[PDB]
Symmetry: D2
Subunit: 249 residues, 4 copies
């Protein structure tokens, strides 16, 4: 398929309904060889199993909160992939109380610091750590959400972290392009897994009249990490069925 | 390939260096069956030859200035493709004196009317004319340029027509989505075929450090007309190597 | 006021509720001397009523569909103001058949042509026709709508004409800035029934904007207070466009 | 003036050339009563010199890196102004090691943390700490830069902090608008050597903007003249960002 020859590391695989799993499935179907991180002991087993289902036995612990953890993960990867072609960053978090109710009341200095560290800094932390390992032609990919561009109820300090993240894509694309590395994001629509009401709304007003699926997101992610997207860098691509471009439907 | 099963009409094929030809080549390589329009008698022969090189003998006259011409073209197409899966609009024109020097001096009411009629109206003219022919899952694609979003010297009334065109993508995506049709544009970077100086500039400041090629544009176009981009509609995708997202390089 | 010593021509005043009246009123309050256009002779006395309230008796006929009418209107204006400091463009039309129902079904080649010619091309037509009359320090302002940026049901081909108008603002600003002219627009929010109900509920400031609010931003954007702003589409819609799923 | 009967707190006045001084000056000219913060005691007399020229003796210490300092600063302010009408946030910092050379090489976890905490989080920290003190009609303003939108060489991690700041503006506007508070920013152009040379040559108005131009837009954006504007990033860079390849 259109990723044959490519080795891509996938972060954030959680369950078979997670976007990262939809991306890993798509990439695998297109011929990539994959490697996977897991955060901690609770998730290790499920990730090993899913990795093995998609032909891989490269399953490595990584906590992106820690610079040391990122480095030793890449040291391990390099024993099997001295060079590789990019990675998929699907990691985003804010403490739970950040995301409920009025933004100005909910946000705190520490909730801000964590959400930005985990959801934005970790993308460039990973790049810094594997930079010399990336072949010419590599592509980095992160996931974002409309809350970066619009104020969405409850999304709160995650909007600011995703906005930081999308500027990180541009700064990274600009810095890394001359060595032959592209860096893009997908701004994914809400995916059916307060939520019920937001989904009903979103299907009714999306031009394609349905929420995107993890398969849809996976196919766009495979494209953006393949040589087929050689012309695209620093771009936030909306994979939300046109939801963001309509108003008052 | 990822377009097998798809029938796509390609407009604007001119010479082997034209974006539309790069798109038709890419689509063909991915398995689509193609049909081609030609504007007039001068171009017919070259289009017939290129069509035949990419497996097609569907070569039909169409002048998008005329509603009658569009209709009879689709009447002919329908004798061989009673239904089909979309088309690529690569048609854009302004009278030559529109594009030289100060915009406010150069623009005229008639140069404005032509550039908007040909470069923007014709996209929805084509959609209106084949709407009932499009299968669920179809995708329409047009080409645009950064001059839609920024004031670029000399591009002049073409910027306004491309801006009209990109709003046409959104209005079309919104109207057609519920019947299962997506509508997108590619905003393509300058392609190496005042021009010399603009190219040197553009390679030096583009993150990927080169101009995009018609192959790069073709691959993104194939993606956007394929089921792989099922999640994307109403979107203007930048295929300019990150050129638009950097500043002062 | 912050427009003292400014002469601004105002188009599109058709009634006291119109956006262009709210703008003229604010400009007059801030010390501008005003002039007005009208299109057909039926409206002429009514515009003289308006101009009189806003301190002016410069009321001139103009049909912006015609190059010669725009030219003769600026020759007339030139008799009272051989130089002036810019104009407000508030003129936007599509035939009514364009603005109802499915966009792709509704739009025609002629409806598209009229919408762009009248709502976008007229803005640069006016600038071309008065270019040598504008002082250094001048400012041109037009009015747009969120339909330029998003697909809004029914707004249809007007969405494309306003997207052309906004690009027109940028290309005009880029061409005229070196002579010392700025060019901007205000994208105004809806102005006061299901659509207003939605709008009030979801706009950050919880109300629709008024012609007074729009008039106040326009006055700023045509005054030297906004000397650092050119080529800009300023959203005066209470924040409606930056929110989603409120 | 158009700020008569307004009380605005101004942060970041460090010298007479600073953007925040140009803003305070314009606000004072338009009739606002002002208050100022300073960070360390070394700068205190110098800020009292400044405040005195702009009509004020409300000069208060605040280190926005610390929640308790922001709290005690608003308690002090509360002794003279138990209610007031908003503030200007002009505070932006990254360690100097962040702002040189290749972005990906330069940026560290700590440099990222400081840049966002000081340049973006402090804006909502201040709002949280004075929320109940703000009158209906109030306005908060911060300062950004085109680096939030585009990758500019050397600006590095500050580009990400300003992109967070701009989103902060939208989420603040959405949360505070229903209480009657607007929140906006100005993305200011560079202010007066190779980079200025480029900038003057390619900006539509053919000059860099001055602190006076920025001060005039800020005054507007904190006055009731801009009552229709919230959640908006207004570009005050002479049109530089809307042009390409000039």
């Amino acid at each position: 398929g259109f990723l044959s020859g490519k080795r891509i590391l996938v972060t954030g695989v959680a369950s078979k309904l997670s976007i990262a799993y939809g991306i890993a499935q798509a990439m695998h179907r297109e011929g990539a060889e994959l490697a996977f991180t897991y955060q901690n002991d609770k998730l290790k087993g499920r990730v090993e199993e899913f990795a093995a289902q998609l032909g891989s036995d490269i399953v490595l612990q990584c906590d992106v909160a820690e610079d040391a953890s990122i480095d030793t993960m890449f040291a391990e990867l390099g024993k099997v992939w001295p060079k590789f072609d990019g990675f998929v960053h699907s990691i985003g978090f804010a403490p739970g109380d950040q995301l409920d109710g009025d933004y100005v009341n909910a946000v705190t200095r520490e909730g801000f610091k964590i959400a930005h560290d985990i959801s934005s800094y970790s993308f460039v932390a990973m790049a810094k750590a594997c930079r010399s390992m990336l072949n010419p032609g590599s592509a980095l990919l992160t996931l974002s959400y409309l809350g970066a561009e619009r104020a969405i109820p409850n999304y709160n300090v995650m909007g600011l972290a995703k906005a930081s993240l999308e500027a990180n894509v541009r700064y990274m694309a600009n810095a890394m392009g001359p060595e032959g590395v592209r860096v893009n994001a997908i701004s994914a629509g809400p995916i059916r897994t307060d939520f019920r009401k937001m989904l009903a709304h979103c299907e009714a007003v999306t031009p394609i009249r349905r929420t995107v699926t993890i398969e849809d997101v996976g196919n766009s992610a495979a494209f953006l990490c393949s040589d087929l997207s050689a012309g695209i860098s620093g771009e936030v691509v909306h994979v939300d069925g046109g939801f963001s471009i309509a108003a008052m439907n």
